[PDB]
């Protein structure tokens, strides 16, 4: 009794926001990406800390190795509503992952929590930590981490496991080549989903161990993970016990964005009749820095003609004139002139696309500004040449491939 | 030199948002009318705000005699952003006008101004006070009023008054029946604005021998600003020297939205191709409660079919279906189904449209929630039954009108 | 298992912060009693909502029917960290006891949580309503009341209640003029605290059925508490089982400042060696509005002596030059001049006492400004002729008895 | 007319807040000078800020090159209250002094301003900048620099320069050897004072030209102001017309806090009966993160005897017992235990000083715990063995110099 809400208060969060994603190619040069925007206004790194709040958790510990600009600057702008006196705080602790929380270790200390969780804040999920902690206490555990069932024909991009009946760690293996299937299962393989949780005074005496290792990578999946395996003091959790979802019939939703595929996939998802993610959720609504944007403005095109929309989400301060859109997102600020045709598209801010342009399976990086007449996605060889295309059929366009191109961005 | 920053540091704004906005008939009976939204996402009271920021007068206050909790909860959240050691405040001062002032005069001292700026924020507008401070000080008067030439049409409801060539007042009238005409044009009328300027000093000294008054109706057009007509002392302040407009060209923007016709003109008026009024303008910004909504989500109607806007709003929040929309402006998370059909009307926020309704030339009061197959604004005896109907042809819909006509608009 | 965390989020809290504070004689007659300064910077209110904080409770609904001004201005400055998203506001709503809460029962409609939380906030208390809601669930009760043994003597200040094995209330008055005594000790009353916690749908439909009521005094301890004591559905909690206290032996902190006395001790008894109220806990920290002031600079007299200071509280922005000080406390921005003594003093803000004075037993309201010479708290008949002096011996200067003895405060 | 309103609207400060301290060998190893505290609660950076609303500016931009955690949780807690829609915001943007502001030119351009401050934050002034604003375009000037007149005993560690008539900048050199003496005095030589203001696009074309010299050092003293001073564009401004300052009579106040001596000889210049900086402005005041915390406690020792306090500061939170001080000044949640004697020094927060020590002329490093017994201050080659003296006198103390020492500092 009393348990649940006496959890999160000793408790602190270490989003791991680093922005690796070496799979978007472009996309994330100039920024992390956890920072990376998504549906409309918000960032990545917001499913990770809207959890946390939601969750209980109010003090948390992002480490942006990148030492960012972009992130800094939105957890300044919208995560500024703390006030340490009532021991809420986001951290900004600049510095493999995990000698990166070994550089922070003397400020975690003075945190003194007893139970830590460790987040990778580049990936899209709804979790609720506590539910997860009472698992961690109930179980008397030194280590859990949040297990799911994946398909095998991608879980060498993830760490595997195989669990005894009790959830307790058997055996663990961190980006296999071959990785095993699940007993009861050979389609699939139980996965890690880079969240953890430790009883604090365990991992400062562990990380020192490994700081003093002159051979380990110091990698959260390939040194210590392994490490309390074969201590045997690491358990599981499902995670559809925590995850968020307002269908219970509905499968777990855990988006890793690591190409930009998934990520044009996951945008696009919301504009869908039914969408898997349900941002509407008033139990857990997701929190961002979400500027005063005028409302999006529809008007006529140069003939007086109308314009059409189909399946598609219009963010705040978009001005839009005739020009069919379909099956698209459209991000803060973006001007469409007339004539246009735009399908399954995903544009980020400020953008500013000329007349008669069409658009087919294309992801617009910020503040670009596409020339009159241009053309995207109907001739792949063509597009392949100026922008960047993925084996999918998906197309990046970013700032740089258009002023290579002769094309003016100074506007 | 040096005069213009140092002017604002010494004055205070006092809003009068009384808003006992009469013709207004019931969208103002639950809410005072600086609370009316106008424009997508704003009230009305953020015009007379922001024109203080931007013209650097950080001290406001406001002076809520309908001790309003919708007026109190958006200063509390929109506008409760500073630090009041660094003497920029907005301040909540509860309660004829004049009168109004006088109660709350033991607050006002201590701010200890040179020069305060009496307004009424139940108006649309632009202005820089500073431009007005300096036309105060160089005309070394003791009221500034703020005169611009309108319709004498309409006239009577605005204080008259005739000036000299150095914008000294000669003669006052509040509210006459015979307006008189401006000498140059018989058309037109130089008017008040309800915005007046005050040193300090004179001002306590004044509304003291109008409080001691047991006639006086304290007011300040019938009481005091022919009271200082006849000593001599008042100036004018012609509009156009201090009205931020982005295109010089055009006629100055000042609204008096005192009945539901410029109401509902005024909120179309952005929806058009060129606005009169520049929302948009970075040189001039103008602040709200800036509330978390995602994006305007527009989706395929129950038939797969698309959706058509022309010359239209869409705020956050909203949700569109198929369902044509015309020169209409959308407030924040309204819902409607399919088969609309939606013409110059203005939907305030909440509200829900079930399937098949068609309207026109309307305005929808906060959350109601109409049900299927209603038709507004075809014919006019039948809507005049129901709902009310000005002269002009406008249509009001409320929560009580609908609730009386049975549709449970519990939601 | 995990119900703890999601009771509070589920539940709104209405702080009653309307006291007149009647036996608190001309201290309270310009501000409303949650207003009143105690213990440095703080306020009384900030004991009631920093309990609603650190308990989980993030939605608090403020009431204030008499003389609205200050608070209105410390909440908005103090505590105006809205986020909307979460659910996390202090809300202003203006309008006996319950009379207030029904006028604004629309507004506690639309927060949609199962409990309520009814505070007097006019009270100084640490409590965690977490661990009163999880009693008032395990019990499958209706309505909460806090109760707590106090002296018969005084009993008839505060509700009395006679309880059985469970908890339940058996009997309730309210008011007596001879209060019972528990039974197990005749010197002692088992009282209620002005905290009641109610299922919320049971309160919106007992709330229209007083309103109705043509001889309720729609109050809650003369109306609704009887009531529900008939229907034998209302339960206490001991507030023992949550009374937050650094020291377990020690006995419940519960101060109700009723009167002038209890005051002045109430602040005196943080200066003591021991405090019964430790302000000094990480773990459960009271917020309020903390303005940049300068450190508590102490000098030299006019004749380069030295000052000295004894048990005594200084805040941010005091000034103190020699003058002896003693079990005192000294509220922000105060000023001291040389050659006083201050023995057993409260002195609210920005007071300056002047050269020469020597106070015993007093309390000074804000802003004052004491002549040189005065001489407070060693001649009881004269002291109780210019200013008001309590039986106990205590007395208290306001500006109002300076100014009618002719000692001008315009500085 | 309406210009001094104008011109800090257009103008955007930038903070070389990256300040190596290279002079305070052991206090800055840690953090960033700016982030350095002083008189109470503040850091030094504030008065650069405070400058700059007080100023106009509203839009800051600092420049935390390295080394800096601190500040980036000062700035984000304390200093973060974006408007971000009426353009005013504290801008962060980590990284020679010039390559600083040159990588981030890109995000700076983004704001648009027509002039732009810049400023050094590592030292400790009160300035209106919009009165240099006023002096520079009044001079049609393309550059203004900030001179004051200095010793020419300590001239070498600055820019010195020599001018005409008209403050046209005639000979400039940074940091000679031997510098010029003014011509109307010997003894003083006219000084730079690291505030420069330019012309906006003038500074962007000149920062793009440094870029490519292969042999600049990428510094403003160095590289920038004698090409300028060649090219005869630069001009000054003589600091007295822009010095806020309440006593017209005394000197303009510019502390360089270069040396450790200078950090503690103007920390006890506040302590002093006639502080030459005045924080009790409240026309012009200071900002800071004002956490919420107790009131100065002042107990009897163990001995039940008097504490004495004699020309000192004793910030919130502290808590002193008997244990006379002089001439010192208290940080915030300080602690001192009985018979101790302090006198002339400067104790950073969280300091715990133990029984019976003695301090004079000493410099405690932030959150050390002093040992029962430790005399400092009265045997100087004891103490330049133990911690760090310098040749005037003075003495810093800091954790790790205790923890060598033998001492724990744990707790
Ligand atoms: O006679 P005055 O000038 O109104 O003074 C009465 C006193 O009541 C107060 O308004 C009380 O203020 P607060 O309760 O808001 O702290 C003082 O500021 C004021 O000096
Ligand atoms: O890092 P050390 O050697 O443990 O010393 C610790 C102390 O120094 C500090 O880093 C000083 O930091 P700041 O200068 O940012 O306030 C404190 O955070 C901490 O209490």
């Known amino acids: 009794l009393m348990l649940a809400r006496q959890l999160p208060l000793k408790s602190v969060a270490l989003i791991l926001a680093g922005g690796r994603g070496t799979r978007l190619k472009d996309l994330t040069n100039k920024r992390a990406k956890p920072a990376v925007h998504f549906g ?45 006196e009532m021991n809420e705080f986001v951290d900004l602790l600049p510095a493999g992952t995990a000698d990166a929380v070994t550089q922070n270790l003397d400020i975690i200390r003075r945190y003194k929590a007893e139970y830590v969780v460790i987040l990778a804040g580049d990936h899209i999920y709804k979790q609720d930590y506590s539910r997860m902690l ?7 555990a030194r280590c859990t981490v949040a297990c799911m069932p994946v398909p095998i024909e991608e879980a060498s991009a993830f760490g595997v496991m195989a669990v005894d009946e009790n959830d307790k760690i058997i055996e663990f293996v961190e980006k296999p080549a071959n990785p095993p299937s699940m007993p009861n299962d050979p389609s699939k393989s139980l996965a890690s989903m880079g969240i953890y949780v430790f009883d604090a005074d365990y991992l400062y005496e562990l990380l ?5 290792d002159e051979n380990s990578s110091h990698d959260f999946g390939k040194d210590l993970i392994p490490k309390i395996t074969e201590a045997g003091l690491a358990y599981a959790h499902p995670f559809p016990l925590s995850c968020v979802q307002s269908d219970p019939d509905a499968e777990p939703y855990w988006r890793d964005v690591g190409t930009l595929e998934a990520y044009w996939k996951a945008n696009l998802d919301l504009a869908s009749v039914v969408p ?44 839009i004139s005739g020009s069919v859109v379909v099956q698209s997102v459209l991000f803060s600020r973006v001007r469409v002139n007339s004539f246009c045709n735009i399908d399954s598209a995903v544009l980020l801010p400020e953008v500013w696309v000329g007349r008669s342009c069409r658009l087919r399976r294309c992801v617009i990086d910020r503040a670009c500004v596409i020339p009159e007449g241009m053309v995207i996605g109907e001739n792949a060889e063509e597009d392949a040449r100026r922008f960047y295309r993925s084996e999918e059929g998906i197309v990046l366009v970013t700032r740089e491939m258009l002023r290579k191109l002769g094309h003016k961005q100074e506007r």
């Open 40 to 84: 409309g206004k918000f960032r990545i790194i917001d499913f990770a800390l809207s959890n946390c709040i939601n969750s209980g958790i109010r003090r948390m510990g992002v480490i942006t190795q990148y030492q960012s600009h972009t992130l800094v600057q939105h957890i300044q702008r919208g995560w500024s509503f703390f006030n340490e």
């Open 134 to 140: 009472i698992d961690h206490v109930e179980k008397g």
């Open 208 to 212: 020192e161990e490994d700081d003093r």
């Open 276 to 319: 898997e993610l349900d941002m509407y959720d008033r139990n857990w609504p997701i929190r961002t820095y979400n500027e005063s944007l005028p409302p999006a403005k529809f008007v006529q095109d140069r003939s007086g003609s109308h314009g059409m929309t189909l399946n598609s989400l219009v963010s705040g301060g978009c001005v």
